[PDB]
Protein backbone atom coordinates (compact mmCIF):
# COMPACT_ATOMS: atom_id res chain seq x y z
CA UNK A 1 0.00 0.00 0.00
CA UNK A 2 2.78 2.45 0.85
CA UNK A 3 4.45 1.56 -2.46
CA UNK A 4 1.19 2.39 -4.25
CA UNK A 5 0.99 5.74 -2.44
CA UNK A 6 4.53 6.52 -3.61
CA UNK A 7 3.45 5.52 -7.14
CA UNK A 8 0.55 7.99 -6.99
CA UNK A 9 2.93 10.71 -5.79
CA UNK A 10 5.19 9.83 -8.74
CA UNK A 11 2.28 10.17 -11.18
CA UNK A 12 1.26 13.52 -9.68
CA UNK A 13 4.87 14.66 -10.07
CA UNK A 14 4.70 13.63 -13.74
CA UNK A 15 1.42 15.56 -14.11
CA UNK A 16 3.01 18.71 -12.69
CA UNK A 17 6.05 18.21 -14.94
CA UNK A 18 3.86 17.87 -18.03
CA UNK A 19 2.06 21.05 -16.97
CA UNK A 20 5.44 22.75 -16.50
CA UNK A 21 6.52 21.78 -20.03
CA UNK A 22 3.16 23.03 -21.33
CA UNK A 23 3.49 26.36 -19.50
CA UNK A 24 7.03 26.73 -20.84
CA UNK A 25 5.79 26.20 -24.39
CA UNK A 26 2.94 28.66 -23.86
CA UNK A 27 5.16 31.31 -22.29
CA UNK A 28 8.31 31.02 -24.43
CA UNK A 29 9.07 33.81 -26.86
CA UNK A 30 9.44 31.43 -29.81
CA UNK A 31 5.98 29.94 -29.29
CA UNK A 32 3.40 29.19 -31.96
CA UNK A 33 1.84 32.67 -31.70
CA UNK A 34 5.07 34.33 -32.82
CA UNK A 35 5.22 32.04 -35.83
CA UNK A 36 1.55 32.75 -36.63
CA UNK A 37 2.25 36.50 -36.60
CA UNK A 38 5.54 36.01 -38.36
CA UNK A 39 4.27 34.03 -41.31
CA UNK A 40 1.16 36.20 -41.68
CA UNK A 41 3.22 39.39 -41.81
CA UNK A 42 5.80 37.78 -44.09
CA UNK A 43 3.04 36.39 -46.33
CA UNK A 44 1.62 39.88 -46.81
CA UNK A 45 5.10 41.29 -47.49
CA UNK A 46 5.85 38.37 -49.83
CA UNK A 47 2.75 38.88 -51.98
CA UNK A 48 3.36 42.62 -52.31
CA UNK A 49 7.04 42.05 -53.07
Amino acid sequence: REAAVLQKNYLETQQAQTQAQLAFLQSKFSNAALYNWLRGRLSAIYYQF
Binding site: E12, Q15, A16, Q19, L22, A23, Q26, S27, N31, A33
Partner: protein
Protein backbone atom coordinates in the same frame (compact mmCIF):
# COMPACT_ATOMS: atom_id res chain seq x y z
CA UNK B 1 -22.97 -7.39 18.95
CA UNK B 2 -22.10 -9.73 21.86
CA UNK B 3 -18.44 -8.96 21.14
CA UNK B 4 -18.97 -5.22 20.70
CA UNK B 5 -18.86 -5.10 16.91
CA UNK B 6 -21.40 -2.91 15.11
CA UNK B 7 -24.28 -4.18 13.01
CA UNK B 8 -24.78 -1.07 10.86
CA UNK B 9 -21.62 -0.51 8.82
CA UNK B 10 -19.72 2.77 8.78
CA UNK B 11 -19.66 5.44 6.10
CA UNK B 12 -16.90 5.57 3.47
CA UNK B 13 -17.32 8.92 1.75
CA UNK B 14 -15.96 9.86 -1.67
CA UNK B 15 -12.49 11.50 -1.57
CA UNK B 16 -11.49 14.62 -3.48
CA UNK B 17 -11.15 14.31 -7.24
CA UNK B 18 -7.84 14.96 -9.03
CA UNK B 19 -8.04 18.47 -10.43
CA UNK B 20 -6.99 19.65 -13.88
CA UNK B 21 -3.94 21.91 -13.80
CA UNK B 22 -4.30 25.28 -15.50
CA UNK B 23 -1.82 27.80 -16.87
CA UNK B 24 -2.06 30.83 -19.11
CA UNK B 25 0.08 32.59 -21.70
CA UNK B 26 -0.60 36.19 -20.74
CA UNK B 27 0.47 38.77 -23.30
CA UNK B 28 1.84 42.31 -23.36
CA UNK B 29 2.23 45.09 -25.92
CA UNK B 30 5.10 47.36 -26.85
CA UNK B 31 4.09 49.92 -29.45
CA UNK B 32 5.64 50.68 -32.78
CA UNK B 33 8.72 52.84 -33.06
CA UNK B 34 8.31 56.52 -33.77
CA UNK B 35 9.69 57.33 -37.19
CA UNK B 36 12.92 59.39 -36.99
CA UNK B 37 13.85 62.75 -38.47
CA UNK B 38 14.80 62.52 -42.14
CA UNK B 39 18.14 63.95 -43.27
CA UNK B 40 18.81 65.08 -46.84
CA UNK B 41 21.89 63.37 -48.32
CA UNK B 42 24.41 64.63 -50.84
CA UNK B 43 24.17 61.73 -53.27
CA UNK B 44 21.45 61.14 -55.85
CA UNK B 45 18.72 58.52 -55.49
CA UNK B 46 20.46 55.39 -56.97
CA UNK B 47 23.59 55.80 -54.81
CA UNK B 48 21.84 56.32 -51.48
Amino acid sequence: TIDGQPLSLSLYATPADPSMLLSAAITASQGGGDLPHAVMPMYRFPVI
